[PDB]
DNA sequence: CGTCGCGACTCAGCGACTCTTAATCGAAGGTTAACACGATGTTTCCCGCCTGTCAAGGGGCTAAGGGC
């Protein structure tokens, strides 16, 4: 809801795709791996 | 009553295939008449058809925001 082209049409498909990959809606630190320390 | 006329006979003789089984390193040298059209390929561009860009335009579908 902060930028355009992010309405209700595509609001849960991206979250489902991210969860299927192995991650989830959060469950980590905000901007934790934002440096080259955990780069791979 | 002998042999030889005439026959086979096996004996020699002459030719001829392989060199275990895995492995130590890759290729390897000569022979030196002249010319001519013709039919036969060889090689270059050149357009023909066609294939492939991205763009322009547009609409139609999908979706997101605002109002009652």
Spatial separation of the C-alpha atoms in residues A5 and A14, rounded to whole Å? 13
Rounded CA-CA distance A38/A32 in Å is 9
Q: Using CA atoms, how far apart are residues A13 and A38, in angstroms rounded to an integer? A: 27
Cα separation of A3 and A32, whole Å? 23
Distance CA(A34)–CA(A28), nearest Å, equals: 12
DSSP, collapsed to helix, strand or coil, labels residue A29 as: coil
Q: Which nucleotide is at minimal CA–C1' distance from A4?
A: B64
Distance A14 CA to B8 C1' (A): 115
Footprint of strand B on the protein (CB under 7 A): A 1, 4-11
Distance CA A9, CA A33 (A): 30
């Amino acid at each position: 809801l902060r930028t355009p082209n992010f309405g209700r049409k595509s609001l849960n498909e991206i979250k489902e795709v991210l969860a299927g990959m192995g991650l989830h809606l959060g469950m980590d630190v905000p901007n934790w791996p934002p440096e080259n320390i955990e780069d791979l």
